[PDB]
Amino acid sequence: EDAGLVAEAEAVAAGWMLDFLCLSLCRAFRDGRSEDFRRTRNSAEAIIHGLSSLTACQLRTIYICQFLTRIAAGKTLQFENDERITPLESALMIWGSIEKEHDKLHEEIQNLIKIQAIAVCMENGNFKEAEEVFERIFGDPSKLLMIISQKDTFHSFFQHFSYNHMMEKIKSYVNYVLSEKSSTFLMKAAAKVVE
Amino acid sequence: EDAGLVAEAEAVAAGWMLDFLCLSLCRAFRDGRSEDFRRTRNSAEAIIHGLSSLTACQLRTIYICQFLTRIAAGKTLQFENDERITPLESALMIWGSIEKEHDKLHEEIQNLIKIQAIAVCMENGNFKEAEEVFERIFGDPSKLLMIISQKDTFHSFFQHFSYNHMMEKIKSYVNYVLSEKSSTFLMKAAAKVVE
Question: What is the Cα–Cα distance from A181 to A14, expressed in whole angstroms?
Answer: 15
Non-local CB neighbours of B57 within 8 Å, separated by 6+ positions:
none
Question: What is the Cα–Cα distance from A110 to B82, expressed in whole angstroms?
Answer: 44
Three-state DSSP class for residue B16:
helix
Taking CB atoms and an 8 Å limit, are A6 and B13 in contact across chains? no
Non-local CB neighbours of A177 within 8 Å, separated by 6+ positions:
A22, A26, A64
- What is B143-171 written as a DSSP string? --TTHHHHHHHT-----S--HHHHHHHHH
Is residue A131 within 8 Å of A151, Cβ to Cβ? yes
Residue A4, Cα to own-chain centre: how many angstroms? 35
* B193 half-sphere exposure, CB direction, 13 A CA radius: 18
Three-state DSSP class for residue A103:
coil
Question: Does A144 reach chain B within 8 Å, measured CB to CB?
Answer: no
Task: Give residue B150's identity as a one-letter amino acid code.
Answer: Q
Q: Which of B169, B55, B11 is nearest to A186 (CA)?
A: B11
Question: What is the Cα–Cα distance from B136 to B180, expressed in whole angstroms?
Answer: 34
Distances (CA, A) of A175 to A158, A181, B130, B157: 29, 10, 59, 65
DSSP A98: S
Minimal C-alpha gap between A33 and chain B (Å): 12
Q: Which of A134, A135, A93, A136 is nearest to A115 (CA)?
A: A134
Quick one: closest CA in B to A28, which residue? B7
Whole-number CA gyration radius for chain B: 19
DSSP A47: H
Question: What is the Cα–Cα distance from A134 to B13, expressed in whole angstroms?
Answer: 44
What count of other Cβ atoms lies within 10 Å of the Cβ of residue A64?
22
Question: What is the Cα–Cα distance from A86 to B33, expressed in whole angstroms?
Answer: 38
Residues of B in contact with A50 (CB under 8 A): 39-40, 42-43
Distances (CA, A) of A67 to B2, B14, B164, B166: 25, 24, 47, 46
Taking CB atoms and an 8 Å limit, are A6 and B191 in contact across chains? yes
Long-range residue pairs from B108-115, CB within 8 A, at least 24 positions apart, any chain: B108/B169, B109/B166, B109/B169, B109/B170, B109/B173, B111/B161, B112/B161, B112/B165, B112/B166, B112/B169, B112/B170, B113/B71, B113/B88, B113/B166, B114/B142, B115/B143, B115/B147, B115/B159, B115/B161
Taking CB atoms and an 8 Å limit, are A10 and B190 in contact across chains? yes
Which helix (H) or strand (E) element contains residue B34? helix B34-49
Question: Does B131 reach chain A within 8 Å, measured CB to CB?
Answer: no
Distances (CA, A) of B8 to A17, A24, A76, A155: 16, 12, 31, 47
Is residue B81 within 8 Å of B89, Cβ to Cβ? no
Question: What is the Cα–Cα distance from A90 to A102, expressed in whole angstroms?
Answer: 18
What count of other Cβ atoms lies within 10 Å of the Cβ of residue B130?
25
Is residue B116 within 8 Å of B110, Cβ to Cβ? no
Non-local CB neighbours of A154 within 8 Å, separated by 6+ positions:
A122, A127
Domains of chain B with CATH codes: 1-195 (1.25.40.210)
Q: Indicate the length of chain B as a whole number.
A: 195
* Helix axes B34-49 and B5-30, enclosed angle (nearest 10): 160
Whole-number CA gyration radius for chain A: 19
Question: What is the Cα–Cα distance from A174 to A27, expressed in whole angstroms?
Answer: 8
Cα dihedral B85, B88, B93, B94 sign: positive
- The closest CB to that of B49, out of A42, A47, A50, belongs to A42
- What is B81-139 written as a DSSP string? TTTTS-HHHHHHHHHTTSS----HHHHHHHHHHHHHHHHHHHHHT-HHHHHHHHHHH--
* A104 half-sphere exposure, CB direction, 13 A CA radius: 0
Question: What is the Cα–Cα distance from B133 to A82, expressed in whole angstroms?
Answer: 39
Task: Give residue A40's identity as a one-letter amino acid code.
Answer: T
Non-local CB neighbours of A137 within 8 Å, separated by 6+ positions:
A89, A92, A114, A117, A118
Is residue B20 within 8 Å of A13, Cβ to Cβ? yes
- The closest CB to that of B50, out of A39, A186, A194, belongs to A39
Is residue B187 within 8 Å of B20, Cβ to Cβ? yes
- What is A143-182 written as a DSSP string? --TTHHHHHHHT-----S--HHHHHHHHHHHHHHHHHHTS
Minimal C-alpha gap between B131 and chain A (Å): 38
Angle at A41 between CA A37 and CA A42, to 5 degrees: 120
